[PDB]
């Protein structure tokens, strides 16, 4: 009856956190380019058949307005609209 | 009930006091669990003892259960004022559902208003002879010169009361002297004359 | 009252599908009770 | 059965102590001059230092078996007040966490003192034979 | 852990049916079974069925086989661990034999060979099953409380709205010849509730 | 990646039917400010 | 007592045997486009290379128990010849280390064979019931 601390290693315990998403396209995304693509050039090609768990019992809490994967996308596309225009032709001696 | 419990057991404070709970084969005790409730009258019940074998969340370490092969006991140790109720087994597995006993009745040993105006106006008359604060849970009520009595209830502080009332007519209000409510012994007398 | 249109800030526009989605970390470390000791 | 990744995380601890080795599977792994390939690394790379935070604890302490262990750490009352039948089967993982959180720290110093005092221990049985 | 909260008492004549309600608060409804026991005054304490809320799983007693049927609504969701829901009970063929008090309970795990068990129990509901009509109460202020006479459907009897609470002693009732019952109780107001009749009435002493 | 299985659910609060998975679905970058263009339609009732 | 991280580097190696649990502990872990995250991360992978280069000596030695251990390789006289009570109450671990740098490949050498040899011998322990 006098009891023993017991670790435990795979347990579903989970916490709030933000980290740094990557992309994922299917591979016909990275098929239709001649350079054509403005994202696909190193995208993960999706898994072929994606696995959805329904976790019975659960009851979580989401807030869609204070999510960050949201903030996360956006940054990226800006970073993503700037960086296809850098090497691209500059019209300063235009203006005239 | 196919559960039979002991009729009545006792036990003097700071003692033990054990509960039986029989029956047949079909019910008790051989491939059954056993569960223990303290049910006061009028109020809800309490888990104390489940699964012929630990205690309920909360339950102080004062009880213990056992069963063996035919009948299961509960042991009370240390008794308590507040210990003095109704205490019921039921008989039950993992599929089917329970069957409540008789019931065992533990004892712990060792420890007038005058018809108002507006009823006058009905016109009835009727005094209210109210009992509290008496142990034991027993006592009897004369009357003398619609005659009803209650039994004896425990109340929220461990002790008992009743009430006994006399409806009288308004004739009789200025025809007798005077009233008399025995208990035993108190007695309360009113003269109806306002 | 009058509803017109508006935007302006596009996060909204990825509000609108990543509304059912939220990020977790795994903490597969847990510790619990029982009587069990490992002998010496 | 096997319910899948995170299958048993809404239900009580010993229904849940069947899936550890699940969990643990899918815990480590299931391009030109971009962003996206420092996007990936560095996810990539927190991935293993998520992973081996867990291992070294998991080391240090008497159990690299990796799966469940016991210890020889008394369960110090204090930290719950809760029974054995009334955890687990009555409670889940998640909900344990969030009672345990505030003393998990304090277990784990708890842990490294045994396991380092057993190895000690045991190197003198080793070598008077 | 939570708290179990049941409808009124109801009076209703033999034959016809009646629905109890009990609704919860403070637990995940689902994760728990809801066991009703009633108690009758002469068979004694009686368990009747009991329901899975997840699943809808029932097992009545072969008794109230025939003549009882549960329901369940579902689960409102308040925090990621508690909930609140509602669970009821309708009784059909009405006989003598079923007055008295009809408890609901929660049960005590999830997983194991007692899962079902009541552990936690509501406030009871009271039903009478009787062809005599309601008669609403009779209040009286007490010449130094107040004094329920004649009603007959269970009384609630506060003070000040609930205020005064302190030093009230409220007794039984009496069953008199009539089938009526009479209790009673001791700025000054005394709030007498009488739901079946629908009718409040609070007193000045 | 928790992925609510509800069909009424406005962003906020618990959901009683949530799913677990790695990638969230086709979610195309469109770029508009009034009106959203090729989105994800609702589930029975429109949403709020 | 906790001396804390490299407490006993000036103390002996008998005194020194009871920190190794300690230093272990803070052997492993305790942006936009810059030159730090860089800076950082490099660095970042050095630490696991330099952890995970020890962890697979320790593995393809007998003891993966990663704390202490003793092993069926006698100590060849030729490498000290000094005596146990005057290293473990007389000598610092960087003083030992600085005799024994010399031979430290060697032996490792042997610890590889004796455990591969020990592991191939018990396998046939196993066959045989
Ligand atoms: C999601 O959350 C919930 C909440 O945490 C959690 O739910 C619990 O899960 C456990 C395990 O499944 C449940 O506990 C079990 O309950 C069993 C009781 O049901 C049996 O008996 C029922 C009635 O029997 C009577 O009537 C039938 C005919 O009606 C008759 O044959 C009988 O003789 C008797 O008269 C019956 O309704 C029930 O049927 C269900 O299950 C069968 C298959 O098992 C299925 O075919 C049916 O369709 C129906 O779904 C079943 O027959 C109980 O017996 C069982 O006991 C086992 O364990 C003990 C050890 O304790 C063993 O010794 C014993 O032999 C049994 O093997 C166990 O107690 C619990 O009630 C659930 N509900 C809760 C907690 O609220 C979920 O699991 C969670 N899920 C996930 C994925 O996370
Ligand atoms: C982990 O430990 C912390 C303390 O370090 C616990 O926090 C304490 O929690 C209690 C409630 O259980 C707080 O009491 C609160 O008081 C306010 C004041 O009115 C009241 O409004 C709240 O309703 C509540 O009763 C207490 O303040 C808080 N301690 C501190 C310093 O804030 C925490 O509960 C522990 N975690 C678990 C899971 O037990
Ligand atoms: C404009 O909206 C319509 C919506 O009706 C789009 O056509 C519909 O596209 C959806 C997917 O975007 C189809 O639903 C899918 O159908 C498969 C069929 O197996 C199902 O398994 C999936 O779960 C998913 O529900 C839907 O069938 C389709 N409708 C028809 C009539 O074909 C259309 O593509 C949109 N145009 C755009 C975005 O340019
Ligand atoms: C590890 O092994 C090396 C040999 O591979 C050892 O180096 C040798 O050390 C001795 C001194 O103990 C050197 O002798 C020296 O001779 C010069 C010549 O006059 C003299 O000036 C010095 O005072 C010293 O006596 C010897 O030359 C040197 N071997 C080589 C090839 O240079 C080294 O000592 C070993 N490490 C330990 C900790 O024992
Ligand atoms: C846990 O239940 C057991 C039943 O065996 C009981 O003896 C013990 O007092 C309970 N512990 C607590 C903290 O309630
Ligand atoms: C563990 O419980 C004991 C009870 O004897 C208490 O004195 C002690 O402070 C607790 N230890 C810690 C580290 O919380
Ligand atoms: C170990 O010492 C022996 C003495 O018998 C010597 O012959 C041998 O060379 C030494 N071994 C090595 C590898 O230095």
Known sequence: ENLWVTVYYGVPVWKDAETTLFCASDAKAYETEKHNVWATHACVPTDPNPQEIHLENVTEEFNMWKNNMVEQMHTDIISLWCQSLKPCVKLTPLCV | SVLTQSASVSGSLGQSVTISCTGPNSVCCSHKSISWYQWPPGRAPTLIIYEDNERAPGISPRFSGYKSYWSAYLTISDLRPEDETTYYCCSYTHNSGCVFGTGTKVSVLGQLFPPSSEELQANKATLVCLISDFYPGAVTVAWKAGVETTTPSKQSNNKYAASSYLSLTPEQWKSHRSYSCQVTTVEKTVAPTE | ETFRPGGGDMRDNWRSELYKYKVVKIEPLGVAPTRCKRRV | ?129 | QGQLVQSGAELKKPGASVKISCKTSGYRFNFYHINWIRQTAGRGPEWMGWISPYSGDKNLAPAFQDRVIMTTDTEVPVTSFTSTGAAYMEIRNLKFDDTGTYFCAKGLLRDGSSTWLPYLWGQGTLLTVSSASTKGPSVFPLAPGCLVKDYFPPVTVSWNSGALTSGVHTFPAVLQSSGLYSLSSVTYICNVNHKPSNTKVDKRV | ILKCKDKKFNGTGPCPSVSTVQCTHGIKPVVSTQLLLNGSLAEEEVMI
């Open chain 4, 1 to 129: 059965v096997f319910l899948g990744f995170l299958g048993a995380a809404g239900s009580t601890m010993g229904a849940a102590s069947m899936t550890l080795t699940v969990q643990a599977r899918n815990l480590l792994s299931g391009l030109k001059l971009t962003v996206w390939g420092i996007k990936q690394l560095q996810a990539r790379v927190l991935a293993v230092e998520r992973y081996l935070r867990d291992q070294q604890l998991l080391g240090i302490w008497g159990c690299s078996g990796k799966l469940i262990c016991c210890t020889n750490v008394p369960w110090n009352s204090s930290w719950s007040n809760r029974n054995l039948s009334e955890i687990w089967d009555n409670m889940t993982w998640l909900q344990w966490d969030k009672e345990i959180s505030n003393y998990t720290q304090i277990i784990y110093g708890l842990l490294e003192e045994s396991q380092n005092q057993q190895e000690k221990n045991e190197q003198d049985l080793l070598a008077l034979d």
